[PDB]
A and B are shown apart, each in its own frame.
Chain A
């Protein structure tokens, strides 16, 4: 900027232990968006037909939800939310926590 020390070099740096490694990833299933999704017993192969998850891959699944729904669906995800689990159980569906 002209000769003064630049803004960043005045600021300190941020440290992260996980160097040389990849961040943890999943495929997340939002609740308010699957309302228009019309299919029970969700799984990997079912969502590929909607082009949300890549077929030539392998990645755990993640569940999130804070809304009320009535259609009973059977979820197959590797991570669950307890409040979302209760809410979806109030919908007469089923959820199994995958390893």
Chain B
């Protein structure tokens, strides 16, 4: 098979896995969440170990 367009457009891979992704719930409704929440979800990260398994066998 071939890789998925949505996946490659939303998954960033680097040395030894550790998929990079951003956090949603930030780009639409500013007044609906506090600035603390906004900057706390502004950064980047990697999904949990269970989802790490769910994505590792998927790509």
- Using a CB–CB distance below 8 Å, which chain A residues touch chain B? 6-14
Candidates A6, A8, A10; contact of B11 at CB < 8 Å = A8
Chain B contact patch, size range = 10 to 19
Q: Which residue of A lies closest to B12 (CB)?
A: A14
- Using a CB–CB distance below 8 Å, which chain B residues touch chain A? 4, 6-7, 9-12, 21-22, 24, 27, 47, 51, 54-55
Task: Indicate if the CB atoms of B51 and A7 lie closer than 8 Å.
Answer: yes
Q: In the bound complex, what is the Cα–Cα distance between A7 and B10 (angstroms)?
A: 10
Q: Which residue of A lies closest to B55 (CB)?
A: A7
Task: Indicate if the CB atoms of A10 and B7 lie closer than 8 Å.
Answer: no
Taking CB atoms, residues of chain B closer than 8 Å to A11 are 10, 21-22, 24
